[PDB]
Design a protein around this ligand. Structure first.
Ligand SMILES: Cc1c(O)nc(CC(=O)O)c(C)c1OP(=O)(O)OC[C@H]1O[C@@H](n2cnc3c(=O)[nH]c(N)nc32)[C@H](O)[C@@H]1O
Ligand SMILES: Nc1ncnc2c1ncn2[C@@H]1O[C@H](COP(=O)(O)OP(=O)(O)OP(=O)(O)O)[C@@H](O)[C@H]1O
Length: 205
């Protein structure tokens, strides 16, 4: 009878083991979700990326090309991938209604900060992680930036950098802690990550 639509553009900066799952969740959403999905990440599928290889990605393929490839010629929503790391130099790649940061490799916070500022300057809501380490059970929680635990390293850095109205998700277990990165945890983070993206997407109206 009365039929509803995808709206908005969502950028996912980072498309590794968590970013990929967020992409998958979003691509499967029906009667809503974003109309446009942008995935940005500079890295290739290697042997260790089982989650990609089980879906049939080849070693050597950029993660964002594999993901783009799943939106085959008849697919109704747009997925475009960009196989580049975000730097101070290519912030022109950051725009949309929601921007979601799920990156890892060294210290990611400076470039993240630059991402959240540039994106909120172009009126996008912003979201990212605060620790996705865990062995399986630990809780999945959500918080705004200015209510975040100040001992939490991410929240600390972003609050000191003067960031406001920024949504964070995580177990709160970190690089520092003993816990590794487990798939059930990345699934639950991803499920929650997606839901918070959707709230913020509705906010674009
Ligand atoms: C570090 C990390 C990872 O290995 N995997 C994933 C998922 C994936 O594979 O896609 C994410 C999201 C991730 O990032 P996380 O949310 O855990 O936090 C990243 C940032 O958070 C900071 N951070 C978090 N915990 C610590 C810590 O315990 N010590 C320090 N020095 N920095 C920390 C780091 O500087 C880093 O830039
Ligand atoms: N500056 C950046 N911009 C966009 N994506 C990034 C950036 N830095 C890291 N990433 C991506 O975030 C993802 C992190 O997830 P995961 O930990 O599974 O991957 P990774 O193999 O650790 O990658 P890396 O070797 O870059 O740390 C990676 O695919 C990585 O390419």
């Amino acid at each position: 009878e009365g039929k509803k639509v995808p709206h908005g553009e969502v950028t996912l900066v980072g498309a590794g083991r968590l970013g990929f799952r967020t992409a998958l969740n979003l691509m499967q959403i029906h009667r809503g979700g974003p109309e446009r999905i942008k995935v940005i990440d500079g890295q290739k599928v290697s042997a260790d990326d089982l989650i990609f290889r089980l879906m049939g990605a080849k070693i050597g393929e950029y993660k964002v090309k594999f993901i783009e490839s799943l939106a085959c010629d008849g697919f109704s929503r747009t997925v475009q991938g960009i196989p580049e790391y975000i730097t101070g130099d290519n912030l022109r790649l950051i725009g949309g209604d929601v921007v979601c940061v799920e990156i890892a490799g060294g210290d990611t916070l400076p470039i993240t900060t630059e991402i959240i500022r540039y994106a909120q300057e172009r009126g996008a809501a912003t979201i990212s992680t605060m620790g996705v380490f865990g062995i399986g059970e630990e809780d999945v929680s959500v918080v705004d930036i200015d209510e975040a635990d100040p001992e939490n390293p991410i929240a600390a850095y972003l609050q000191a950098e003067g960031i406001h109205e920024h949504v964070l998700v995580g177990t709160g277990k970190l690089i520092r802690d003993w816990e590794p990165v487990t798939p059930h945890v990345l699934d639950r983070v991803s499920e929650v990550m997606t839901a918070e993206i959707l709230k913020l997407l509705r906010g674009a109206q």
